[PDB]
Amino acid sequence: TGRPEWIWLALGTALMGLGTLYFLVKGMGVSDPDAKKFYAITTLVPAIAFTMYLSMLLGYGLTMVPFGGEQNPIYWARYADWLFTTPLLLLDLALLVDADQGTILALVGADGIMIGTGLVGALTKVYSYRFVWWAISTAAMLYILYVLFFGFTSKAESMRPEVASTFKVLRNVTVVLWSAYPVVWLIGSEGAGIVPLNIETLLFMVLDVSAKVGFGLILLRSRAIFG
Amino acid sequence: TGRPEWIWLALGTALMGLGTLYFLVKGMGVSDPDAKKFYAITTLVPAIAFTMYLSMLLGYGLTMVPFGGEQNPIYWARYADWLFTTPLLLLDLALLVDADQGTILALVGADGIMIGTGLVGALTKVYSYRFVWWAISTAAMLYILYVLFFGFTSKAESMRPEVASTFKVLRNVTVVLWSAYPVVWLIGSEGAGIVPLNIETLLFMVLDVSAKVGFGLILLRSRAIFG
Amino acid sequence: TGRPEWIWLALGTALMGLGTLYFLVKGMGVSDPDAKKFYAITTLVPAIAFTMYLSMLLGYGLTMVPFGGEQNPIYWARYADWLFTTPLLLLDLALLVDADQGTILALVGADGIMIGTGLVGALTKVYSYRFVWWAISTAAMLYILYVLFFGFTSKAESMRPEVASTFKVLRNVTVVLWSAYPVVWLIGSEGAGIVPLNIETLLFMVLDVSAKVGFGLILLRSRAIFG
Numbered sequence: 001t002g003r004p005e006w007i008w009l010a011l012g013t014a015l016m017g018l019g020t021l022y023f024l025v026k027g028m029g030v031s032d033p034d035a036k037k038f039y040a041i042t043t044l045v046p047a048i049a050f051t052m053y054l055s056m057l058l059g060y061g062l063t064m065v066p067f068g069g070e071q072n073p074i075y076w077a078r079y080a081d082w083l084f085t086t087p088l089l090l091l092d093l094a095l096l097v098d099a100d101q102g103t104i105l106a107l108v109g110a111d112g113i114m115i116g117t118g119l120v121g122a123l124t125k126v127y128s129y130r131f132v133w134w135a136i137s138t139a140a141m142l143y144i145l146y147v148l149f150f151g152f153t154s155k156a157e158s159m160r161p162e163v164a165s166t167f168k169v170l171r172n173v174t175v176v177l178w179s180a181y182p183v184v185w186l187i188g189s190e191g192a193g194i195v196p197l198n199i200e201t202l203l204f205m206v207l208d209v210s211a212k213v214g215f216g217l218i219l220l221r222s223r224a225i226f227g
Numbered sequence: 228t229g230r231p232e233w234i235w236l237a238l239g240t241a242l243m244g245l246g247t248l249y250f251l252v253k254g255m256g257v258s259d260p261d262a263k264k265f266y267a268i269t270t271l272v273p274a275i276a277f278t279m280y281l282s283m284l285l286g287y288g289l290t291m292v293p294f295g296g297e298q299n300p301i302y303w304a305r306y307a308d309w310l311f312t313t314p315l316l317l318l319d320l321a322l323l324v325d326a327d328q329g330t331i332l333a334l335v336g337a338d339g340i341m342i343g344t345g346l347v348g349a350l351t352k353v354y355s356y357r358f359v360w361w362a363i364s365t366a367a368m369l370y371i372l373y374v375l376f377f378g379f380t381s382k383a384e385s386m387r388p389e390v391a392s393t394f395k396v397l398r399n400v401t402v403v404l405w406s407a408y409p410v411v412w413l414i415g416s417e418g419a420g421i422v423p424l425n426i427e428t429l430l431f432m433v434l435d436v437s438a439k440v441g442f443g444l445i446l447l448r449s450r451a452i453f454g
Numbered sequence: 455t456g457r458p459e460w461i462w463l464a465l466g467t468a469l470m471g472l473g474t475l476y477f478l479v480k481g482m483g484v485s486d487p488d489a490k491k492f493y494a495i496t497t498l499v500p501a502i503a504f505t506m507y508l509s510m511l512l513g514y515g516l517t518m519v520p521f522g523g524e525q526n527p528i529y530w531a532r533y534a535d536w537l538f539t540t541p542l543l544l545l546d547l548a549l550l551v552d553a554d555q556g557t558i559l560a561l562v563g564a565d566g567i568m569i570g571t572g573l574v575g576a577l578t579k580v581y582s583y584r585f586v587w588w589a590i591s592t593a594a595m596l597y598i599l600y601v602l603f604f605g606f607t608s609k610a611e612s613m614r615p616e617v618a619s620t621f622k623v624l625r626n627v628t629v630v631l632w633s634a635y636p637v638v639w640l641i642g643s644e645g646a647g648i649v650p651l652n653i654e655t656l657l658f659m660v661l662d663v664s665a666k667v668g669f670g671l672i673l674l675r676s677r678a679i680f681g
């Protein structure tokens with residue numbers, strides 16, 4: 001049920017908020033139109049995360065879904081977050097590597113299906129079908145990471161060393177972090193309740209902050225964002 | 228009610244999936260950044276259609292709406308599909324003809340209102356109002372087809388013969404197919420139940436596959452997508 | 455409750471519709487691709503407003519929310535409207551002033567959070583929390599107006615006099631009008647019921663038409679939209 005994890009939601013709300021404030025108070029006198037895009041994209045990520053986490057702490061983003069043989073607490077707000085949030089992170093990577101519009105669109109579409117599909121899964125009443133949606137969603141994710149790791153790295157090789165290396169760190173961090181989400185989902189309250197909603201919220205919390213604030217820090221503090 | 232049409236939903240899911248796989252396995256070694264956009268846009272259409280159709284087969288995208296004087300089964304998932312799907316098809320046409328940003332925006336907006344409006348209609352409890360929404364939606368569609376047929380054809384005349392002719396076929400196919408949707412809606416379970424939900428799902432199924440996979444095949448197999 | 459304000463909804467529906475028709479019947483023979491964008495963006499605003507207002511008149515966009523100690527009537531359709539509508543207006547201003555992509559993205563994101571946040575607030579069951587969302591939403595708005603008034607005006611100074619001055623009028627009108635929305639919300643049925651839903655709907659109606667049709671008239675009737 002939703003009550004004991006309140007603390008992980010509260011620390012998450014706090015961390016996203018401060019992460020937003022810090023980024024805002026760092027790109028203020030930035031004139032380079034390129035760095036400007038990066039700060040805008042990167043500042044918005046934690047800001048959206050902030051609002052959704054707060055809706056979870058306040059209980060608004062929690063819903064109850066009947067499946068298996070009981071009433072399960074499903075925090076839907078995560079998808080609302082990730083829906084805009086994951087595409088933004090991808091965009092940062094695309095700008096850094098100067099990706100083709102076509103691949104950016106394919107990536108954004110793949111990302112949309114990933115979250116949309118995972119949302120349908122977390123809300124499906126037929127326990128067994130939830131995992132079908134999980135598989136489709138995970139397939140979409142693998143497609144995204146495949147392009148990031150192999151297609152983007154290649155595009156990064158044509159940029160100057162600062163960009164290429166900062167991209168490498170960002171690439172490694174997103175590939176590692178993103179792939180932890182589906183596993184958490186599968187073993188948490190949205191799938192096989194192996195892990196309690198308590199510990200689950202703590203995992204997502206560490207993953208989200210790292211994937212946003214951490215990712216944000218690595219990027220916004222490198223010279224890579226400058227033309 | 229929703230059970231007998233299961234087969235049309237299943238074949239639709241299958242056809243969209245295979246259509247997605249085929250397109251994916253055809254634009255793999257494509258380097259031309261132009262063709263790349265077309266494959267990305269065109270591959271995403273059937274992929275989204277795939278997920279929504281599956282939600283209908285699995286019963287998730289079906290809801291019940293009280294109107295007239297009974298409980299009517301309304302597959303809402305179609306709008307979720309068409310919401311992203313119809314705009315994408317329009318974009319393919321715009322890229323092919325190299326449309327102005329302003330007209331692309333007007334077209335996307337008109338398309339958004341068309342599906343949004345039709346969604347409101349399919350879910351409205353006052354039987355008589357459903358048709359008001361239908362009219363507004365149909366008006367938006369007519370605006371889109373008017374621009375495609377007269378405005379776009381003109382823009383196509385300035386491209387090389389392969390583009391102009393492929394555009395012509397695509398234009399004719401979308402104008403004919405798209406206009407069948409409102410009629411089906413009006414005579415099906417969403418409006419006047421003249422046609423059973425059974426036969427309706429079969430019509431949309433033929434229309435959707437043609438309008439996506441068929442449209443996709445005609446486009447992706449022509450040299451028109453190359454610069 | 456929702457019944458007596460029906461007239462403000464009906465006049466609003468009428469005014470948005472005629473405002474859409476007028477704009478459509480004014481940008482018909484416009485060839486300048488720049489003016490074309492402005493007409494497209496500006497025509498879509500009242501069109502969307504039209505559909506949402508009609509959903510409110512017809513009772514579809516009204517929902518009931520329990521909070522405080524009673525059943526309150528909340529017209530949710532406003533957010534659906536403003537969600538696409540406010541960003542479009544911002545885009546008109548950005549195009550006029552030729553804003554950086556980064557600031558356009560930050561503005562669109564800030565706007566999304568503003569409406570998304572206000573929507574969550576209008577639907578939150580814990581009376582006290584509604585105002586938290588209100589504050590966050592108002593903070594997002596202030597961020598937008600700050601950039602419009604100080605950042606954009608500066609960008610406008612680099613354009614020719616017709617653009618700079620038309621921008622000034624548009625700037626003043628949006629800053630004044632937009633800031634009236636949060637106050638209305640705070641004293642209306644969504645917050646402290648100081649003002650009845652009757653009078654509230656009349657205020658939003660005057661604000662919406664001015665902010666869209668009025669804004670639209672000032673812009674589309676100046677030479678500022680031409681390159």
Ligand SMILES: CC(C)CCC[C@@H](C)CCC[C@@H](C)CCC[C@@H](C)CCOC[C@@H](CO[C@H]1O[C@H](CO)[C@@H](O)[C@H](O)[C@H]1O[C@H]1O[C@H](CO[C@@H]2O[C@H](CO)[C@H](O)[C@H](OS(=O)(=O)O)[C@H]2O)[C@@H](O)[C@H](O)[C@@H]1O)OCC[C@H](C)CCC[C@H](C)CCC[C@H](C)CCCC(C)C
Nearest residue numbers: 063066108109112113116117123287289290303306307311
């Ligand atoms: C790219 C962009 C950023 C992505 C944004 C997508 C977003 C904008 C789309 C909005 C789309 C719009 C057209 C759809 C509107 C649907 C609306 C009418 C309602 C939908 O409701 C379903 C929702 C989830 O709601 C469910 O959970 C809540 C909370 O827990 C419940 O309150 C609600 O009731 C739930 O609804 C489901 O169950 C109801 C069930 O009642 C059941 O009745 C049956 C009868 O047999 C049984 O009795 C059931 O059993 S039982 O438990 O009691 O035992 C009983 O429960 C149903 O009535 C409801 O109909 C429903 O099934 O779904 C969310 C769907 C998401 C949004 C779909 C996303 C679609 C796709 C993946 C998008 C891909 C994006 C693509 C990548 C874009 C590409 C282009 C780019 C620009 C590049």
Ligand SMILES: CC(C)CCC[C@@H](C)CCC[C@@H](C)CCC[C@@H](C)CCOC[C@@H](CO[C@H]1O[C@H](CO)[C@@H](O)[C@H](O)[C@H]1O[C@H]1O[C@H](CO[C@@H]2O[C@H](CO)[C@H](O)[C@H](OS(=O)(=O)O)[C@H]2O)[C@@H](O)[C@H](O)[C@@H]1O)OCC[C@H](C)CCC[C@H](C)CCC[C@H](C)CCCC(C)C
Nearest residue numbers: 290293335336339340343344350514516517530533534538
């Ligand atoms: C461009 C882009 C791709 C398009 C994406 C648009 C998408 C992102 C928007 C999300 C928008 C967001 C701000 C709105 C959130 C609304 C939220 C609070 C809930 C909304 O619910 C209404 C939904 C449908 O839900 C309905 O169906 C489900 C399933 O069947 C039901 O479970 C649900 O309850 C239904 O809700 C309606 O009825 C409820 C009724 O209870 C009633 O109470 C009355 C009391 O008098 C009576 O008792 C009724 O009678 S009775 O039957 O029992 O006899 C009883 O039923 C109400 O309480 C609910 O409030 C509701 O009325 O609506 C979907 C709306 C859609 C999304 C609107 C789209 C808006 C517009 C067309 C978009 C244009 C896009 C434009 C083109 C963009 C341009 C810019 C581009 C970038 C270019």
Ligand SMILES: CC(C)CCC[C@@H](C)CCC[C@@H](C)CCC[C@@H](C)CCOC[C@@H](CO[C@H]1O[C@H](CO)[C@@H](O)[C@H](O)[C@H]1O[C@H]1O[C@H](CO[C@@H]2O[C@H](CO)[C@H](O)[C@H](OS(=O)(=O)O)[C@H]2O)[C@@H](O)[C@H](O)[C@@H]1O)OCC[C@H](C)CCC[C@H](C)CCC[C@H](C)CCCC(C)C
Nearest residue numbers: 060062063076079080084517520562563566567570571577
């Ligand atoms: C940028 C673009 C244009 C913006 C578009 C955003 C849009 C596309 C997003 C769609 C997102 C999707 C992933 C989320 C789907 C959620 C879905 C599953 C259902 C969500 O439901 C919640 C809705 C509102 O619904 C509520 O109102 C209706 C009508 O009045 C109700 O019918 C419905 O039931 C309500 O739901 C709430 O309450 C239910 C409660 O039941 C409760 O149970 C508890 C148990 O303890 C108590 O018993 C309660 O008490 S009591 O009253 O009876 O006494 C009892 O009520 C819950 O079950 C439900 O779960 C729910 O809490 O929420 C709308 C959320 C909005 C859309 C979030 C927006 C997110 C963020 C701000 C977006 C920022 C955008 C950013 C700027 C983009 C940046 C990138 C750009 C490209 C630049």
Ligand SMILES: CC(C)CCC[C@@H](C)CCC[C@@H](C)CCC[C@@H](C)CCOC[C@@H](COP(=O)([O-])OC[C@H](O)COP(=O)([O-])O)OCC[C@H](C)CCC[C@H](C)CCC[C@H](C)CCCC(C)C
Nearest residue numbers: 017020024031039040043044047557560563564593594605
């Ligand atoms: C705890 C919180 C998380 C809770 C708050 C709720 C929150 C979720 C909602 C807030 C809205 C939020 C979504 C906003 C995100 C904004 C973020 C994306 C911005 C990124 O930033 C992008 C820049 C774009 O820059 P520019 O204007 O174009 O400048 C051009 C210059 O003139 C050089 O030109 P040249 O190249 O030709 O030489 O934003 C514009 C630059 C401006 C000119 C300068 C702006 C300065 C700021 C207004 C001040 C910084 C903020 C404050 C320290 C406090 C923040 C309070 C909070 C309530 C907003």
Ligand SMILES: CC(C)CCC[C@@H](C)CCC[C@@H](C)CCC[C@@H](C)CCOC[C@@H](COP(=O)([O-])OC[C@H](O)COP(=O)([O-])O)OCC[C@H](C)CCC[C@H](C)CCC[C@H](C)CCCC(C)C
Nearest residue numbers: 103106109110139140151244247251258266267270271274
């Ligand atoms: C049955 C199914 C429908 C069910 C699955 C669920 C499904 C709904 C969800 C899946 C996600 C789906 C939304 C993904 C859609 C992707 C689609 C839009 C892609 C269109 O494709 C666009 C390209 C962009 O190309 P590039 O990377 O930029 O290459 C540049 C090159 O180096 C030349 O450069 P130069 O010009 O300078 O010379 O995608 C990138 C090109 C890559 C470099 C190569 C990628 C190869 C693929 C990973 C392999 C093809 C797929 C496999 C046969 C099987 C598919 C499995 C499925 C589970 C994903």
Ligand SMILES: CC(C)CCC[C@@H](C)CCC[C@@H](C)CCC[C@@H](C)CCOC[C@@H](COP(=O)([O-])OC[C@H](O)COP(=O)([O-])O)OCC[C@H](C)CCC[C@H](C)CCC[C@H](C)CCCC(C)C
Nearest residue numbers: 330333336337366367378471474478485493494497498501
């Ligand atoms: C009461 C109503 C509110 C209720 C109706 C419901 C409503 C909510 C839904 C309707 C859909 C609505 C969303 C549509 C909005 C459209 C709006 C955004 C359009 C803005 O307009 C943008 C232009 C783009 O122009 P272009 O086609 O690219 O022209 C290029 C030219 O050849 C020069 O080229 P050069 O530069 O190289 O020299 O639209 C294309 C220009 C076309 C070529 C000309 C089009 C003309 C129109 C079809 C006729 C005008 C409309 C009618 C008077 C009546 C309207 C009826 C209503 C039902 C649609």
Ligand SMILES: CC(C)CCC[C@@H](C)CCC[C@@H](C)CCC[C@@H](C)CCOC[C@@H](COP(=O)(O)O)OCC[C@H](C)CCC[C@H](C)CCC[C@H](C)CCCC(C)C
Nearest residue numbers: 135136137138139140141142143145146149150151255256
């Ligand atoms: C979602 C799933 C179902 C679908 C997966 C798609 C996959 C089957 C097809 C992938 C095809 C592409 C590689 C196309 C060929 C492109 C050609 C130019 C050949 C190059 O391909 C070679 C390498 C990239 O080059 P280098 O690493 O040497 O630098 O691909 C590296 C390829 C590596 C080895 C494969 C990617 C490995 C993923 C992580 C394995 C996914 C399978 C999981 C074990 C399934 C788990 C499900 C369980 C729960 C049932």
Ligand SMILES: CC(C)CCC[C@@H](C)CCC[C@@H](C)CCC[C@@H](C)CCOC[C@@H](COP(=O)(O)O)OCC[C@H](C)CCC[C@H](C)CCC[C@H](C)CCCC(C)C
Nearest residue numbers: 362363364365366367368369370372373376377378482483
């Ligand atoms: C949605 C409805 C309500 C609104 C429709 C809008 C309509 C009334 C206005 C259209 C205006 C534009 C034509 C503006 C004039 C532009 C000028 C340059 C004149 C050119 O106009 C001439 C031609 C295009 O040129 P060519 O075909 O010769 O190459 O337009 C070809 C015009 C053709 C003849 C009209 C388009 C025909 C549509 C399909 C008919 C819609 C009416 C249906 C019969 C209503 C059904 C409703 C029932 C169920 C109540």
Ligand SMILES: CC(C)CCC[C@@H](C)CCC[C@@H](C)CCC[C@@H](C)CCOC[C@@H](COP(=O)(O)O)OCC[C@H](C)CCC[C@H](C)CCC[C@H](C)CCCC(C)C
Nearest residue numbers: 028029589590591592593594595596597599600603604605
């Ligand atoms: C949402 C709230 C909580 C957060 C507000 C953010 C704010 C605290 C920080 C603003 C920081 C920026 C000004 C950053 C500094 C940039 C430097 C170059 C210095 C320039 O700053 C000077 C001027 C702009 O220049 P000119 O007017 O002289 O031409 O800013 C003009 C600054 C003016 C004076 C401030 C903007 C005034 C707003 C309207 C006041 C908001 C506070 C309300 C009274 C709170 C109401 C809440 C109640 C209900 C509890």
Ligand SMILES: *C/C=C(C)/C=C/C=C(C)/C=C/C1=C(C)CCCC1(C)C
Nearest residue numbers: 118134137138141178181182185211
């Ligand atoms: C700030 C948030 C980030 C970086 C979120 C990333 C989320 C994912 C990669 C989620 C993936 C999921 C699946 C692959 C399948 C099951 C459900 C999800 C949505 C958890």
Ligand SMILES: *C/C=C(C)/C=C/C=C(C)/C=C/C1=C(C)CCCC1(C)C
Nearest residue numbers: 345361364365368405408409412438
């Ligand atoms: C892949 C799907 C396609 C090409 C769908 C096209 C759909 C339309 C043109 C739908 C139009 C409708 C109306 C004009 C009015 C009534 C309701 C709709 C949504 C069925």
Ligand SMILES: *C/C=C(C)/C=C/C=C(C)/C=C/C1=C(C)CCCC1(C)C
Nearest residue numbers: 572588591592595632635636639665
């Ligand atoms: C056509 C509509 C326009 C220009 C709408 C503008 C709306 C706003 C600026 C709304 C702002 C709000 C807040 C700042 C807080 C509380 C709730 C809102 C959504 C009313």
Ligand SMILES: [Xe]
Nearest residue numbers: 090091104107
């Ligand atoms: Xe992207």
Ligand SMILES: [Xe]
Nearest residue numbers: 317318331334
């Ligand atoms: Xe388009």
Ligand SMILES: [Xe]
Nearest residue numbers: 544545558561
């Ligand atoms: Xe904007």
